[PDB]
Amino acid sequence: SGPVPSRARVYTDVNTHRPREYWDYESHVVEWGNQDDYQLVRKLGRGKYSEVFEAINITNNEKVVVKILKPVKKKKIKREIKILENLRGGPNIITLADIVKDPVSRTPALVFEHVNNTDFKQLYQTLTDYDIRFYMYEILKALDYCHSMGIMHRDVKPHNVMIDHEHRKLRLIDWGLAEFYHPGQEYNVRVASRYFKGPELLVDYQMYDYSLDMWSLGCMLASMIFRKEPFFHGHDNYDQLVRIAKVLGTEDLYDYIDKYNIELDPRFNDILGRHSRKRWERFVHSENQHLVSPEALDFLDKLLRYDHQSRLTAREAMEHPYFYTVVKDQAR
Amino acid sequence: SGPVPSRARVYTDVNTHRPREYWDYESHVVEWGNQDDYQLVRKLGRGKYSEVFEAINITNNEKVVVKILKPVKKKKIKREIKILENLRGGPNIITLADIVKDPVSRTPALVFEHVNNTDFKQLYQTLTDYDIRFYMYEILKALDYCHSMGIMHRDVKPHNVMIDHEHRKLRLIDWGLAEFYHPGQEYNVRVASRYFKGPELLVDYQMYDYSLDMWSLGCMLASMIFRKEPFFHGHDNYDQLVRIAKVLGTEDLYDYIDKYNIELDPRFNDILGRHSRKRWERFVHSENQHLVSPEALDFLDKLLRYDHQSRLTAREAMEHPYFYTVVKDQAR
Amino acid sequence: VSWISWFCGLRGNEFFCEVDEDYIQDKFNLTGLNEQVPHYRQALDMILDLEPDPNQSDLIEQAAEMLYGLIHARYILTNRGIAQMLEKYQQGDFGYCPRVYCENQPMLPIGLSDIPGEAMVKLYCPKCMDVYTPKSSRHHHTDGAYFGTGFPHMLFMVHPEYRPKRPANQFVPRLYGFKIHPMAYQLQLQAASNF
Amino acid sequence: EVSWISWFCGLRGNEFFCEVDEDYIQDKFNLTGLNEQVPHYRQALDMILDLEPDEDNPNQSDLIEQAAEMLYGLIHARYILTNRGIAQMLEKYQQGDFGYCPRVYCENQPMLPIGLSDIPGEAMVKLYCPKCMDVYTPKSSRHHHTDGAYFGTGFPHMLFMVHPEYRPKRPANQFVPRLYGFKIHPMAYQLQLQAASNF
Ligand SMILES: [Zn+2]
Ligand SMILES: [Zn+2]
């Protein structure tokens, strides 16, 4: 009894070999700025945790984005602030410009640099084959950089990818769920968004790593190339695994929970059944075939695997033939 | 039964030999200006017929004076407007600049050129002997001019004399009681101000003329040189004649109402008594003696007479020794 | 009981002061009002508690109430009128400014029109210098013309000492501590224009 | 019979309050931090949700009741910032439940409730007119005891951020002071204010 331990194939000990204050976010002292520098213009969007507004910095007349954080555990607030600052400057990562507070109620707000307010669920169904390749590569730059800096995003989905299509500019946003990787650590399986949850979360396996993000990136790519959104459309967390199992096959799933000796939740017993590994060509049809190539299908297949350890790392993914034509244009 | 008719010793027929529209004020067509040219700044004063404000002509940014006229008979309004315009340009006469109207209530207002708000009653008690001479001469210029143009002021008093002492500038104001002289005409004896009412008004003698103004000018001079304001301080209109009779004597008064065959009020009989003509030197004392000279006393004596026909005309007054030293300085 | 004293005592007539008999008895003060009220001669008689001589008695009563109103509008512009109204203002008889930042400044009655019929009585706050509707509904039937467009303005022309200071503080919209930029009202009014 | 929420919002004086959804309260995450602001949190919450109480002490039951009223108020302030809260308050606004602007030139513009402070105790509820954008005291005296903090400083501002289409046009007309038809020049104020100051 008891689960087999796991560890990341890359950047396993980047946090071990850094000063505590890098990853000990509970101890981070927040340096507050002047709230009266920022005035609101319009609401951009909302979430469970936050309310988001476009605003103007009256000192220099520039547009900003203010993510107002609803009451949560101070712990969670510091975690996001530390991560945003550790990754600040990095490729395709959102730039945190300032942190402010309502001196009376003490509601904290994050101030980011302006991003053109079009996420991915917005045009990523009218993009060309090269466009999908191009933007997928840009997500991998951020995913490789934040992994290399010892951080897993834990909520990769289209709502969290901001695209200025006019300027071919991409930003990976919302790090309120991101967490530091420490080998051996048992993490919370309650992360992401149902449709982007990795198998490891759905079976309650806690010793996951950066690979979780690669599953989610798989779910995105499948959605974009096959033109089905979301790709795995589960009604609850248990059903979510049944949807995945209908595509990947139940054989590799029972192999997976054996390799890692994971005690399944009793309410999976009679629900999963027996399903074959389906061929990726099955989801191809006339509306989507212009986006589906053999390189796309090989790449997808190497991302969407039950075994987190067999999934491509973000750096490995970047090496795939699917991006050869992008990497060629990029060197210019 | 029936009073003896009377006529002015000067300018008796100036109105007869003019076009009707000069003196037929009932027929004068008022040419209205644009009210929105004028905006109020502060209240200057008030009275039985009008409210007066300082204002600014927003077209040329200049100070003006707006005399707002309370509801009266249109007749009275036209009378003033005609007189102000007939005398416009004349020496020490108030210049009427414009006439305006409130579209809605149709309340009419007169707009005059700015005058320094310092009425005789403020300074005329800290004036020197030459100052009284100088300003009294200036009043006589107006009084002679308006008499020569066929008009009697009918309300000469200190409140109606504006003085800019700094610039030695004098204006005879408020012509809402002024009227045209027509020989033979019976006028209203309800004019002036109790303390400045001439005996002819107090006995109900209606066929008066310009000489009424000379009585009033007397009452002002007596006030200024003796430093007693008002000089004849009657409690009612009947008592007013008693106060006059106590100074001028009852002898000349009964001679006056016999010469003109005037039926007295039965109640004047019972309050007048017997009083001697008092010497003008009686009112002289230490506080006033610096203002009293023999020329002043002769001049006063020739102004304050029951018989309106024996009073000096404004032109005659101007010739008196009292003003010799003034007329000389006005010979540069 | 004097008619003036009765009328000014009625519910709704809380804004009116009691006009002096001297003022009414002087015909010169009522110049022109005979051309504005029906039954002038009889209306005046009722106001002055003089010998009168059906529904006709109620028709006169209306005219008396209209004439009293129009006399009032002239009377309160005079030194004595102001003096009386000023006394009522010091007691707060006219109500108080609903504007939070005016800090309950006592108000004065004003007419938006000088002609009877056009508008009911409104209240003028001398601090924010704006015009308000009376909170109490009993005052929604008193004609504005019975107070006139110039009453409060005259009052401060005559007693400038009584003009209150401008409000020290202002309302500042904040959302979660953030002020709202002016470019937000322009965008808000644009969207409302497109619907 | 009726629920506690339904009772409270039904009381005289509570005309500005909407009925908060049970879903919203039953989700602990929405009431984060409120346990550090109200005494008897556990029992106050129980009363609001019509759950079995814990009555021998006649004044302890009234102490819980106060805390329930305070907690409901503070939940309200959060709830009306959310899409559904706005939706409910917007319904009340369309009915004019919050009263109308006393400014003559606002032409009876319906108003919205606003708090001048987010802290309980500092100020009672005021009303915000979206046309003249100023803040007013309620005309009816029943509303002079409802805490402003139970509505909050940002409610009306959020509402128009969320439904900008509901923002009324600026007033077409202005009050113009006239005396016997004459406008009053602005120098006439600078001159008056002095006379009160110099006094
Ligand atoms: Zn005010
Ligand atoms: Zn308003």
Mutation site for D-interface testing, chosen from B34, B37, B41, B98 by largest number of D Cβ within 10 Å = B41
Considering the domain architecture, whether residues C86 and C98 belong to the same structural domain is answered as no
C28 and chain D in contact, CB less than 8 A: no
Q: Which method, experimentally, gave rise to this model?
A: X-ray
Collect all residues of chain B within an 8 Å Cβ-Cβ radius of residue D187.
Answer: 41, 56
Q: Which CATH number belongs to the domain containing residue C114 in this structure?
A: 2.20.25.20
Mutation site for D-interface testing, chosen from B32, B43, B53, B59 by largest number of D Cβ within 10 Å = B53
Residue of chain C minimizing CA distance to D141 = C135
Sheet holding A108-113, edge to edge: A96-101, A108-113, A62-69, A50-57, A38-46, C178-180, C174-175
Q: Evaluate the CA torsion angle A10, A218, A91, A22 in order and state its sign.
A: negative
Tokens for B72? 């009266």
Contact (CB<8Å) B35/D182: yes
How far apart are the CA of D130 and the centre of ligand 2, in A?
Answer: 7
Residue C137 lies in a domain: yes
Query: CA-to-CA distance for B117 and A79, rounded, in angstroms?
Result: 77
Helices (H), A196-323: 199-202, 211-226, 237-248, 250-259, 294-303, 314-318
Residue A310 labelled as part of a binding site: no
Residue D139 lies in a domain: yes
How far apart are the CA of D171 and the centre of ligand 2, in A?
Answer: 9
Q: Are the C-beta atoms of residues A215 and A157 closer than 8 Å to each other?
A: no
Residues 144-163 of C with CB under 8 A from D: 149-150, 153-154, 156-157, 160-163
Query: CA-to-CA distance for C124 and C96, rounded, in angstroms?
Result: 9
Chains with 3 or more CB pairs under 8 A to chain A? C, D
Q: How far is CA D198 from CA B89, B118, D195, in A?
A: 40, 22, 5
- Domain boundary, last residue among C90, C124, C147: C90
Considering the domain architecture, whether residues D84 and D111 belong to the same structural domain is answered as no
Contact (CB<8Å) B43/C114: no
Considering the domain architecture, whether residues C96 and C76 belong to the same structural domain is answered as no
How many CB contacts within 8 angstroms connect chain A with chain C?
45
For domain A6-23+115-332, give the CATH superfamily. Answer: Transferase(Phosphotransferase) domain 1 (1.10.510.10)
Which amino acid is residue C82, in one-letter code? I
Query: CA-to-CA distance for A211 and A305, rounded, in angstroms?
Result: 10
Resolution attained, angstroms = 3.1
Collect all residues of chain C within an 8 Å Cβ-Cβ radius of residue D116.
Answer: 100
Strand (E) positions, C8-149? 108-110, 122-124, 131-132
Contact (CB<8Å) B42/C157: yes
Contact (CB<8Å) C165/D196: yes
Collect all residues of chain B within an 8 Å Cβ-Cβ radius of residue C77.
Answer: 51
Residue C125 labelled as part of a binding site: yes
D174 and chain C in contact, CB less than 8 A: no
Q: How far is CA C40 from CA C28, C35, C64, in A?
A: 15, 8, 8
CA distance from start to end of chain A: 55
With 0-12 CB in 10 A as exposed, 13-18 as middle and 19+ as buried, what is A167?
exposed
C-alpha distance from D175 to closest chain A C-alpha (Å): 30
Tokens for D87? 């939706």
Angle among Cα A153, A156, A157 to the nearest 5 degrees reads 160
Query: CA-to-CA distance for B1 and B263, rounded, in angstroms?
Result: 8
Considering the domain architecture, whether residues C84 and C2 belong to the same structural domain is answered as yes
Q: Are the C-beta atoms of residues C76 and C17 closer than 8 Å to each other?
A: yes
- In order, the DSSP letters of A43-88 are EEEE-SSEEEEEEEETTTTEEEEEEEEPS--HHHHHHHHHHHHHST
C-alpha distance from D161 to closest chain A C-alpha (Å): 6
Mutation site for B-interface testing, chosen from C31, C35, C37 by largest number of B Cβ within 10 Å = C31
Report helix, strand and coil shares of chain D as percent, to nearest 5.
Answer: 45, 10, 45
Continuous segment of H or E residues that includes residue A111: strand A108-113
For chain B, domain boundaries: 6-23+115-332, 24-114
Indicate the residue of C174, C177, C181 with minimum beta-carbon distance to A41: C181
Considering the domain architecture, whether residues C7 and C86 belong to the same structural domain is answered as yes
Task: Provide the angle, in degrees to the nearest 10, between the axes of the packed helices B251-259 and B237-248.
Answer: 110
Q: Are the C-beta atoms of residues D92 and D98 closer than 8 Å to each other?
A: yes
Residue in the structure block whose two tokens are 């007054």: B317
Q: Are the C-beta atoms of residues B193 and B157 closer than 8 Å to each other?
A: yes
Task: Say what the alpha-carbon torsion angle D61, D67, D68, D71 is, to the nearest 10 degrees.
Answer: -170
Considering the domain architecture, whether residues D113 and D163 belong to the same structural domain is answered as yes
Contact (CB<8Å) B42/C79: no
Query: CA-to-CA distance for A216 and A197, rounded, in angstroms?
Result: 7
Indicate the residue of C31, C115, C157 with minimum beta-carbon distance to B71: C31
SS3 A155: coil
Considering the domain architecture, whether residues D68 and D155 belong to the same structural domain is answered as no
Q: Are the C-beta atoms of residues C145 and C113 closer than 8 Å to each other?
A: yes
Q: Which CATH class is domain A24-114?
A: alpha beta
Catalytic residue among B155, B174, B209, B213: B155
Tallying the residues shown for chain B, one arrives at 332
How far apart are the CA of D100 and the centre of ligand 1, in A?
Answer: 16
The breaks in chain A (C to N more than 2.5 Å) occur after none
Indicate the residue of C31, C77, C114 with minimum beta-carbon distance to B104: C114
Considering the domain architecture, whether residues C95 and C141 belong to the same structural domain is answered as yes
Q: Which CATH number belongs to the domain containing residue C60 in this structure?
A: 1.10.1820.10
C-alpha distance from D170 to closest chain A C-alpha (Å): 18
Task: Provide the angle, in degrees to the nearest 10, between the axes of the packed helices A294-303 and A211-226.
Answer: 150
Q: Show the domain range for C154.
A: 91-168
Residue C109 lies in a domain: yes
C-alpha distance from C12 to closest chain D C-alpha (Å): 17
- In order, the DSSP letters of C143-189 are BGGGT-TTHHHHHHHH-GGGPPPPPS-----EETTEEEPTHHHHHHH
Query: CA-to-CA distance for B120 and B170, rounded, in angstroms?
Result: 9
Query: CA-to-CA distance for B250 and B256, rounded, in angstroms?
Result: 10
Looking at the 3D structure of chain C, how many domains does it have?
A: 2
Residue C102 labelled as part of a binding site: yes
Query: CA-to-CA distance for A247 and D15, rounded, in angstroms?
Result: 56
Indicate the residue of D81, D118, D161 with minimum beta-carbon distance to A104: D118
Strand (E) positions, chain B? 38-46, 50-57, 62-69, 96-101, 108-113, 151-152, 161-164, 169-172, 179-180
Residue D101 labelled as part of a binding site: yes
Residue D186 lies in a domain: no
Indicate the residue of A40, A46, A71 with minimum beta-carbon distance to D33: A71
Residue A104's DSSP bridge partners are none
How far apart are the CA of A263 and the centre of ligand 2, in A?
Answer: 65
Tallying the residues shown for chain C, one arrives at 195
Sheet holding B108-113, edge to edge: B38-46, B50-57, B62-69, B108-113, B96-101
Considering the domain architecture, whether residues C67 and C95 belong to the same structural domain is answered as no
D168 and chain C in contact, CB less than 8 A: yes
C-alpha distance from B229 to closest chain D C-alpha (Å): 30
